[PDB]
């Protein structure tokens, strides 16, 4: 089926306006209806828009949907942001019989200053290498909002196998931390010139690289 | 307007059969198609049943949808329970003027075995030392249940400052992962013979030690 691609996160201060996009990978956006769901972590999804731009009763006119055929995208626009609007937002449409969801966008309503993450990338330690493990760790700390994406590369190529990233955790300084680890074997590690960890926060991507050494 | 009511939780042992009901408060259950979605906290929902009883491709045949007109209800039955099935399950139907979700059922698979953590301790990266930092990271993975305590040592002495440990999070193998990081200065790092991370899980302790490089 086609895919619906949404940004991983958006943020704004109370009272401002924010927009979330939902781009269809193949086919036309207008050939099936787009719904938007709001979900607060721990609760069920709630419909805030159906049929591209219709609002259910109980949903304030601060929420508006639209379609842009020449970006092949749908958008949800929330004006007059309130702290209760902080949630995950999912766009949803159909491919033939099949429901397709976007990946979801976390909308943070800023409750404190933005803070860029400190990123540290650690190459395999002596002890684990002697145990036939070459796990890399990308440590991500001191960030707000508490939403990040991590992407790994082997040389210049995207890595997907063997990546785990922890759920951001609020630490003693009231900012978030997480770690991404890439479980390589020693052979995998030594077969490439380098590996990189790419961390995206608030729409900007930072990168670190480590390579095999002899000691 | 109608509601879809599901039980809050269901629990069962591996290999067995569980049923999740979805009762429609108003209007006939058969007047609109019922969908079922599976969701892991942090991810988009996955369709497991659509049109009451159809499985999308890639959905285990252990998942079955049914309708019971006499109790005005729909059911998801999961046979041959696997740990991979632990998730929230939502039923969903239509109002024509809305998309309505049930409240969700958390499915718990009982009797998961304890698993001791894999602990890997990393010394400061070369790159962070060139940027005047010497943060250490202790990666703690693949443990169950999802509670650890962590203590650090400088030489043989307890370290009380500079420690942060993340809230354990469930990874794609349904075991938990966390990291503890110790924010040292380069001067602190080189002033000791070693630093150690001690991870305690279910009354068993694992301790790792690293020391400044000899390179």
PDB file of C-alpha atoms in Angstrom, chain B residues 15-196:
ATOM      1  CA  UNK B  15      -0.422 -20.862  24.267  1.00  0.00           C
ATOM      2  CA  UNK B  16      -3.947 -20.078  25.410  1.00  0.00           C
ATOM      3  CA  UNK B  17      -6.885 -18.259  23.891  1.00  0.00           C
ATOM      4  CA  UNK B  18      -8.089 -14.769  24.821  1.00  0.00           C
ATOM      5  CA  UNK B  19     -11.280 -12.940  23.782  1.00  0.00           C
ATOM      6  CA  UNK B  20     -11.675  -9.135  23.782  1.00  0.00           C
ATOM      7  CA  UNK B  21     -15.238  -7.825  23.454  1.00  0.00           C
ATOM      8  CA  UNK B  22     -16.427  -4.511  21.975  1.00  0.00           C
ATOM      9  CA  UNK B  23     -20.028  -3.659  22.878  1.00  0.00           C
ATOM     10  CA  UNK B  24     -21.916  -0.941  21.037  1.00  0.00           C
ATOM     11  CA  UNK B  25     -24.018   1.200  23.359  1.00  0.00           C
ATOM     12  CA  UNK B  26     -26.444   2.465  20.711  1.00  0.00           C
ATOM     13  CA  UNK B  27     -27.359   1.321  17.196  1.00  0.00           C
ATOM     14  CA  UNK B  28     -26.844  -2.158  15.833  1.00  0.00           C
ATOM     15  CA  UNK B  29     -23.296  -3.585  15.809  1.00  0.00           C
ATOM     16  CA  UNK B  30     -23.904  -4.863  12.243  1.00  0.00           C
ATOM     17  CA  UNK B  31     -24.949  -1.585  10.736  1.00  0.00           C
ATOM     18  CA  UNK B  32     -21.262  -0.582  10.199  1.00  0.00           C
ATOM     19  CA  UNK B  33     -18.015  -2.532   9.752  1.00  0.00           C
ATOM     20  CA  UNK B  34     -15.874  -3.134  12.872  1.00  0.00           C
ATOM     21  CA  UNK B  35     -12.074  -2.814  12.685  1.00  0.00           C
ATOM     22  CA  UNK B  36      -9.513  -3.934  15.256  1.00  0.00           C
ATOM     23  CA  UNK B  37      -6.138  -2.267  15.809  1.00  0.00           C
ATOM     24  CA  UNK B  38      -3.086  -3.396  17.718  1.00  0.00           C
ATOM     25  CA  UNK B  39      -0.876  -0.703  19.230  1.00  0.00           C
ATOM     26  CA  UNK B  40       2.412  -0.730  21.144  1.00  0.00           C
ATOM     27  CA  UNK B  41       2.913   2.450  23.249  1.00  0.00           C
ATOM     28  CA  UNK B  42       5.087   4.790  21.116  1.00  0.00           C
ATOM     29  CA  UNK B  43       4.005   3.388  17.677  1.00  0.00           C
ATOM     30  CA  UNK B  44       1.190   3.863  15.234  1.00  0.00           C
ATOM     31  CA  UNK B  45      -1.720   1.420  15.360  1.00  0.00           C
ATOM     32  CA  UNK B  46      -1.569  -1.717  13.209  1.00  0.00           C
ATOM     33  CA  UNK B  47      -4.786  -3.067  11.582  1.00  0.00           C
ATOM     34  CA  UNK B  48      -5.282  -6.714  12.614  1.00  0.00           C
ATOM     35  CA  UNK B  49      -8.972  -7.106  11.514  1.00  0.00           C
ATOM     36  CA  UNK B  50     -11.043  -5.065   9.115  1.00  0.00           C
ATOM     37  CA  UNK B  51     -14.633  -5.561   7.796  1.00  0.00           C
ATOM     38  CA  UNK B  52     -15.429  -7.518  10.999  1.00  0.00           C
ATOM     39  CA  UNK B  53     -13.393 -10.592  10.256  1.00  0.00           C
ATOM     40  CA  UNK B  54     -10.902  -9.973   7.432  1.00  0.00           C
ATOM     41  CA  UNK B  55      -7.121 -10.233   8.222  1.00  0.00           C
ATOM     42  CA  UNK B  56      -4.695  -7.890   6.391  1.00  0.00           C
ATOM     43  CA  UNK B  57      -1.643  -9.575   4.896  1.00  0.00           C
ATOM     44  CA  UNK B  58       1.073 -10.233   7.458  1.00  0.00           C
ATOM     45  CA  UNK B  59      -1.287 -10.583  10.383  1.00  0.00           C
ATOM     46  CA  UNK B  60      -1.036 -13.940  12.151  1.00  0.00           C
ATOM     47  CA  UNK B  61      -3.976 -16.255  11.514  1.00  0.00           C
ATOM     48  CA  UNK B  62      -4.177 -16.569  15.356  1.00  0.00           C
ATOM     49  CA  UNK B  63      -6.192 -13.274  15.226  1.00  0.00           C
ATOM     50  CA  UNK B  64      -9.932 -13.756  14.478  1.00  0.00           C
ATOM     51  CA  UNK B  65     -12.756 -11.225  14.324  1.00  0.00           C
ATOM     52  CA  UNK B  66     -16.446 -12.010  14.971  1.00  0.00           C
ATOM     53  CA  UNK B  67     -19.783 -10.231  15.436  1.00  0.00           C
ATOM     54  CA  UNK B  68     -22.564 -11.242  17.902  1.00  0.00           C
ATOM     55  CA  UNK B  69     -25.835  -9.483  17.102  1.00  0.00           C
ATOM     56  CA  UNK B  70     -27.553 -10.815  20.230  1.00  0.00           C
ATOM     57  CA  UNK B  71     -25.103  -9.029  22.639  1.00  0.00           C
ATOM     58  CA  UNK B  72     -24.696  -6.145  20.141  1.00  0.00           C
ATOM     59  CA  UNK B  73     -20.949  -6.839  20.325  1.00  0.00           C
ATOM     60  CA  UNK B  74     -17.851  -7.599  18.293  1.00  0.00           C
ATOM     61  CA  UNK B  75     -14.950  -9.763  19.433  1.00  0.00           C
ATOM     62  CA  UNK B  76     -11.313 -10.212  18.746  1.00  0.00           C
ATOM     63  CA  UNK B  77     -10.131 -13.687  19.601  1.00  0.00           C
ATOM     64  CA  UNK B  78      -6.417 -14.346  19.799  1.00  0.00           C
ATOM     65  CA  UNK B  79      -5.506 -18.056  19.888  1.00  0.00           C
ATOM     66  CA  UNK B  80      -2.075 -19.510  20.731  1.00  0.00           C
ATOM     67  CA  UNK B  81      -0.968 -16.445  22.734  1.00  0.00           C
ATOM     68  CA  UNK B  82       2.629 -15.354  22.211  1.00  0.00           C
ATOM     69  CA  UNK B  83       4.519 -12.678  24.215  1.00  0.00           C
ATOM     70  CA  UNK B  84       4.718 -10.664  20.905  1.00  0.00           C
ATOM     71  CA  UNK B  85       0.929 -10.204  21.298  1.00  0.00           C
ATOM     72  CA  UNK B  86       1.209  -7.938  24.358  1.00  0.00           C
ATOM     73  CA  UNK B  87      -0.274  -4.622  23.242  1.00  0.00           C
ATOM     74  CA  UNK B  88      -3.266  -2.357  23.444  1.00  0.00           C
ATOM     75  CA  UNK B  89      -6.204  -3.429  21.214  1.00  0.00           C
ATOM     76  CA  UNK B  90      -8.822  -0.967  19.969  1.00  0.00           C
ATOM     77  CA  UNK B  91     -12.072  -1.738  18.205  1.00  0.00           C
ATOM     78  CA  UNK B  92     -13.387   0.936  15.819  1.00  0.00           C
ATOM     79  CA  UNK B  93     -16.593   1.578  13.865  1.00  0.00           C
ATOM     80  CA  UNK B  94     -18.439   4.475  12.128  1.00  0.00           C
ATOM     81  CA  UNK B  95     -21.240   7.002  12.816  1.00  0.00           C
ATOM     82  CA  UNK B  96     -21.123   8.232   9.141  1.00  0.00           C
ATOM     83  CA  UNK B  97     -20.769  11.668  10.923  1.00  0.00           C
ATOM     84  CA  UNK B  98     -17.757  10.199  12.933  1.00  0.00           C
ATOM     85  CA  UNK B  99     -15.159   7.481  13.457  1.00  0.00           C
ATOM     86  CA  UNK B 100     -15.583   5.959  16.951  1.00  0.00           C
ATOM     87  CA  UNK B 101     -12.945   4.017  18.910  1.00  0.00           C
ATOM     88  CA  UNK B 102     -13.360   1.695  21.856  1.00  0.00           C
ATOM     89  CA  UNK B 103     -11.510   2.607  25.055  1.00  0.00           C
ATOM     90  CA  UNK B 104      -8.808   0.013  24.480  1.00  0.00           C
ATOM     91  CA  UNK B 105      -7.826  -3.275  26.116  1.00  0.00           C
ATOM     92  CA  UNK B 106      -4.359  -3.864  27.410  1.00  0.00           C
ATOM     93  CA  UNK B 107      -3.402  -7.497  26.834  1.00  0.00           C
ATOM     94  CA  UNK B 108      -0.896  -9.005  29.320  1.00  0.00           C
ATOM     95  CA  UNK B 109       0.813 -12.366  28.608  1.00  0.00           C
ATOM     96  CA  UNK B 110       1.511 -13.997  31.972  1.00  0.00           C
ATOM     97  CA  UNK B 111       4.496 -16.036  33.159  1.00  0.00           C
ATOM     98  CA  UNK B 112       7.268 -14.237  31.233  1.00  0.00           C
ATOM     99  CA  UNK B 113      10.592 -15.572  32.468  1.00  0.00           C
ATOM    100  CA  UNK B 114      12.997 -13.371  34.380  1.00  0.00           C
ATOM    101  CA  UNK B 115      15.926 -12.278  32.342  1.00  0.00           C
ATOM    102  CA  UNK B 116      19.134 -10.857  33.792  1.00  0.00           C
ATOM    103  CA  UNK B 117      20.488  -7.723  32.166  1.00  0.00           C
ATOM    104  CA  UNK B 118      23.287  -7.497  29.654  1.00  0.00           C
ATOM    105  CA  UNK B 119      25.540  -4.737  31.021  1.00  0.00           C
ATOM    106  CA  UNK B 120      28.163  -2.966  28.929  1.00  0.00           C
ATOM    107  CA  UNK B 121      30.259  -0.101  30.321  1.00  0.00           C
ATOM    108  CA  UNK B 122      31.887   2.349  27.954  1.00  0.00           C
ATOM    109  CA  UNK B 123      34.801   4.685  28.724  1.00  0.00           C
ATOM    110  CA  UNK B 124      34.843   8.259  27.425  1.00  0.00           C
ATOM    111  CA  UNK B 125      34.979   8.606  23.612  1.00  0.00           C
ATOM    112  CA  UNK B 126      38.022  10.250  22.066  1.00  0.00           C
ATOM    113  CA  UNK B 127      35.764  12.891  20.475  1.00  0.00           C
ATOM    114  CA  UNK B 128      34.100  13.921  23.773  1.00  0.00           C
ATOM    115  CA  UNK B 129      37.533  14.084  25.520  1.00  0.00           C
ATOM    116  CA  UNK B 130      38.698  16.505  22.775  1.00  0.00           C
ATOM    117  CA  UNK B 131      35.535  18.569  23.632  1.00  0.00           C
ATOM    118  CA  UNK B 132      36.538  18.653  27.347  1.00  0.00           C
ATOM    119  CA  UNK B 133      34.016  16.044  28.534  1.00  0.00           C
ATOM    120  CA  UNK B 134      34.352  12.511  29.963  1.00  0.00           C
ATOM    121  CA  UNK B 135      30.815  11.117  30.297  1.00  0.00           C
ATOM    122  CA  UNK B 136      30.635   7.338  30.798  1.00  0.00           C
ATOM    123  CA  UNK B 137      27.678   5.214  29.789  1.00  0.00           C
ATOM    124  CA  UNK B 138      26.446   1.929  31.269  1.00  0.00           C
ATOM    125  CA  UNK B 139      24.076   0.226  28.764  1.00  0.00           C
ATOM    126  CA  UNK B 140      21.608  -2.118  30.446  1.00  0.00           C
ATOM    127  CA  UNK B 141      19.552  -4.257  28.064  1.00  0.00           C
ATOM    128  CA  UNK B 142      17.349  -7.304  27.603  1.00  0.00           C
ATOM    129  CA  UNK B 143      16.140  -7.522  31.188  1.00  0.00           C
ATOM    130  CA  UNK B 144      12.817  -8.577  32.694  1.00  0.00           C
ATOM    131  CA  UNK B 145      11.039  -7.488  34.796  1.00  0.00           C
ATOM    132  CA  UNK B 146      11.680  -3.809  34.022  1.00  0.00           C
ATOM    133  CA  UNK B 147      13.253  -2.476  37.227  1.00  0.00           C
ATOM    134  CA  UNK B 148      16.988  -2.065  37.955  1.00  0.00           C
ATOM    135  CA  UNK B 149      18.981  -0.044  40.425  1.00  0.00           C
ATOM    136  CA  UNK B 150      22.364   1.273  39.525  1.00  0.00           C
ATOM    137  CA  UNK B 151      25.342   2.390  41.612  1.00  0.00           C
ATOM    138  CA  UNK B 152      28.669   3.783  40.487  1.00  0.00           C
ATOM    139  CA  UNK B 153      32.130   3.539  41.969  1.00  0.00           C
ATOM    140  CA  UNK B 154      35.290   5.603  41.522  1.00  0.00           C
ATOM    141  CA  UNK B 155      38.122   3.189  42.363  1.00  0.00           C
ATOM    142  CA  UNK B 156      36.430   1.256  45.230  1.00  0.00           C
ATOM    143  CA  UNK B 157      34.504   4.303  46.564  1.00  0.00           C
ATOM    144  CA  UNK B 158      30.825   5.159  45.955  1.00  0.00           C
ATOM    145  CA  UNK B 159      30.151   8.045  43.464  1.00  0.00           C
ATOM    146  CA  UNK B 160      27.222  10.165  44.534  1.00  0.00           C
ATOM    147  CA  UNK B 161      27.247  13.064  42.054  1.00  0.00           C
ATOM    148  CA  UNK B 162      26.831  13.234  38.293  1.00  0.00           C
ATOM    149  CA  UNK B 163      24.682  10.054  37.926  1.00  0.00           C
ATOM    150  CA  UNK B 164      21.542   9.793  35.787  1.00  0.00           C
ATOM    151  CA  UNK B 165      19.653   6.599  34.981  1.00  0.00           C
ATOM    152  CA  UNK B 166      16.827   6.426  32.426  1.00  0.00           C
ATOM    153  CA  UNK B 167      13.375   4.904  33.080  1.00  0.00           C
ATOM    154  CA  UNK B 168      13.462   1.301  31.683  1.00  0.00           C
ATOM    155  CA  UNK B 169      11.604   0.967  28.395  1.00  0.00           C
ATOM    156  CA  UNK B 170      10.266  -2.079  26.638  1.00  0.00           C
ATOM    157  CA  UNK B 171      12.172  -2.747  23.427  1.00  0.00           C
ATOM    158  CA  UNK B 172      11.170  -4.732  20.315  1.00  0.00           C
ATOM    159  CA  UNK B 173      11.934  -8.084  22.059  1.00  0.00           C
ATOM    160  CA  UNK B 174       9.528  -7.216  24.951  1.00  0.00           C
ATOM    161  CA  UNK B 175      12.426  -7.018  27.408  1.00  0.00           C
ATOM    162  CA  UNK B 176      13.562  -3.705  28.907  1.00  0.00           C
ATOM    163  CA  UNK B 177      16.498  -1.419  28.326  1.00  0.00           C
ATOM    164  CA  UNK B 178      17.990   1.527  30.129  1.00  0.00           C
ATOM    165  CA  UNK B 179      21.221   3.454  30.396  1.00  0.00           C
ATOM    166  CA  UNK B 180      22.985   5.055  33.294  1.00  0.00           C
ATOM    167  CA  UNK B 181      25.501   7.843  32.513  1.00  0.00           C
ATOM    168  CA  UNK B 182      28.032   9.514  34.763  1.00  0.00           C
ATOM    169  CA  UNK B 183      29.009  13.005  33.758  1.00  0.00           C
ATOM    170  CA  UNK B 184      32.711  13.322  34.609  1.00  0.00           C
ATOM    171  CA  UNK B 185      35.265  15.973  33.782  1.00  0.00           C
ATOM    172  CA  UNK B 186      38.424  14.792  32.035  1.00  0.00           C
ATOM    173  CA  UNK B 187      40.321  15.641  35.249  1.00  0.00           C
ATOM    174  CA  UNK B 188      38.025  13.397  37.320  1.00  0.00           C
ATOM    175  CA  UNK B 189      38.286  10.544  34.806  1.00  0.00           C
ATOM    176  CA  UNK B 190      42.090  10.550  34.736  1.00  0.00           C
ATOM    177  CA  UNK B 191      42.432  11.049  38.518  1.00  0.00           C
ATOM    178  CA  UNK B 192      41.168   7.506  39.349  1.00  0.00           C
ATOM    179  CA  UNK B 193      42.454   4.076  38.413  1.00  0.00           C
ATOM    180  CA  UNK B 194      38.972   3.002  37.332  1.00  0.00           C
ATOM    181  CA  UNK B 195      35.264   3.563  37.430  1.00  0.00           C
ATOM    182  CA  UNK B 196      32.643   0.849  37.875  1.00  0.00           C
TER     183      UNK B 196
END
